[PDB]
Amino acid sequence: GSSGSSGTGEKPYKCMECGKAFGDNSSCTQHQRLHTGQRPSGPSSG
Ligand SMILES: [Zn+2]
């Protein structure tokens, strides 16, 4: 499963923003941090 991540329900265990499984919450909660930032897709070629 690489593409096509959607459905009906909530997954407070694994991050949905990107989709990455963690081992310990400690690291899980932290991950969100990076997400907090703008996290812009990216500029156009050039
Ligand atoms: Zn994420």
* Residues ending a continuous segment of the chain before a break (C–N > 2.5 Å): none
Q: Ligand 1 centroid vs 3 CA: distance in angstroms?
A: 15
Domain count, the chain: 1
The domain in which residue 2 lies consists of 1-46
Pair 2, 19: CB distance under 8 Å: no
Pair 20, 14: CB distance under 8 Å: yes
What tokens were used for 24?
């310990």
Helix%, strand%, coil% for the chain, nearest 5: 25, 5, 70
Ion ligand 1 nearby residues (CB, 5 A): 15, 17-18
Q: Ligand 1 centroid vs 44 CA: distance in angstroms?
A: 23
Q: Ligand 1 centroid vs 4 CA: distance in angstroms?
A: 16
**Matching residue, tokens 């690489």:** 2
